[PDB]
Subunit: 185 residues, 3 copies
């Protein structure tokens, strides 16, 4: 298991710096990865969403980008702080993370470098997640795997709302999901 | 593995006593908890939902409250009896036993101000696995007083159902654990 | 404790035409629960450019996976047998990856009329929404019924359904995760 230790330490920079708290838990079920994501926006643009005085403010992306060794790159709007393995020994204080088996699968979700035949959607997840747990504030979570340039691997969260919000913090309800990938030989 | 035996023997007090049967499965892949929930109401208020006569009949909550030992309370709207390790051990009691690594994380669950929706899961289930009969399942982790931990199933619908047995499709979810033992 | 399609598989499904379509399903077995993940791409065929302006009734596609006593896949299935197993080659127990029969029993008209239903009608269903090339514009209902088919020991039955009248669309649905409950019962019953 490799996570954003389930405490707050702002660690993620959408509009302003340390902006926000994304709690993302990855847990390695052999072949498949089981993943949980809340996102809480402390300060910044999306601490007050208003689409009367900022209509366009209808979408936030937040990006994790990884190595050959699947370590988190700066070009990620997530900070390498408080992003490690937890084993019951204070491993998360260390940060020697070289965690390639937790990585979206190349064979499943390759880089999108385009007979005429290949899968647009295989590497998308798209559902709905709810602000404050309030069913009126319908938000479209979209998850993309290994879709970004400059990286071996790349998980992309991207929330999107059509209904115009009127002085709304971006707190999102948690979201469970799975992808695959590991070491190949 | 820690479950309400996948077969039906009623265990739930909505409206009437033993009203209905809840199917819930807690499997623990390490520090994360993968869970299944279906719900069939067999006698009473929800057994023939008619909102063309009894409108307010539009919501159903079912709570499980927990101890330091991770044990179910009398204050929980599901019955104690068959709640344990799956088949083999299922009779032998879970009491003296802790069940704390199945308990939702207590640290997990515009200022230093906290999250409102961190301890929510909010989506759609379907009565009959019919698209038309849209329900909205709302879970809420560790949000009940007078208890060490809490898991809280809320099922709402906007559509006025004419003669209908609440009979929820299976829904799948995770939540962060806490696995000292 | 993992059983799949290849993450990047060769056309492994007949829907419309022979070798029609390409189903990436991954079942991983977390103890007493099967974590699952399913994409569908349709390469050639009818559902490679669905055009609901010309064929209104083309608004469903069904993929069934009928199993054995021993959890082996069946000619009857719409998923071809060649590619399957976990990432080694012989073949198969394959049962411990099988939807539990007490939860999702085979549907028999031998059912008590005292209001104690052994299961619900829908307990075995899992109904939600996937999107065709992640474009939210294109809503797709996914529908998994468990053990719902006859002439088999155990079943899995992805049905895909769309309301909206597409034009020239190639059925390529977003990945969907779900769980079902596991059969794996220790033959020895104390």
């Amino acid at each position: 298991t490799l996570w954003t230790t389930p405490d707050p330490s702002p660690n993620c920079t959408i509009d302003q710096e340390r902006d926000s708290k994304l709690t993302l838990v990855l847990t390695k079920c052999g072949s498949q990865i089981l993943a949980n994501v809340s996102l809480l926006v402390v300060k910044g643009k999306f601490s007050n969403i208003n689409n009367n005085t900022n209509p366009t403010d209808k979408k936030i992306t937040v990006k994790l980008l990884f190595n050959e060794k699947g370590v988190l790159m700066d070009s990620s709007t997530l900070k390498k702080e408080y992003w490690n393995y937890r084993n019951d020994n204070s491993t998360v204080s260390q940060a020697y993370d070289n965690a390639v088996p937790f990585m979206p699968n190349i064979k499943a979700y390759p880089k999108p470098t385009t007979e005429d035949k290949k899968s647009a959607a295989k590497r998308y997840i798209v559902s709905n997640v709810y602000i404050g747990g309030l069913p009126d504030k319908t938000v479209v979570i979209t998850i993309k795997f290994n879709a970004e340039t400059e990286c071996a691997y790349s998980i992309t969260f991207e929330f999107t709302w059509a209904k115009t919000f009127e002085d709304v913090q971006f707190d999102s309800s948690s979201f469970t999901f799975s992808y695959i990938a590991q070491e190949n030989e």
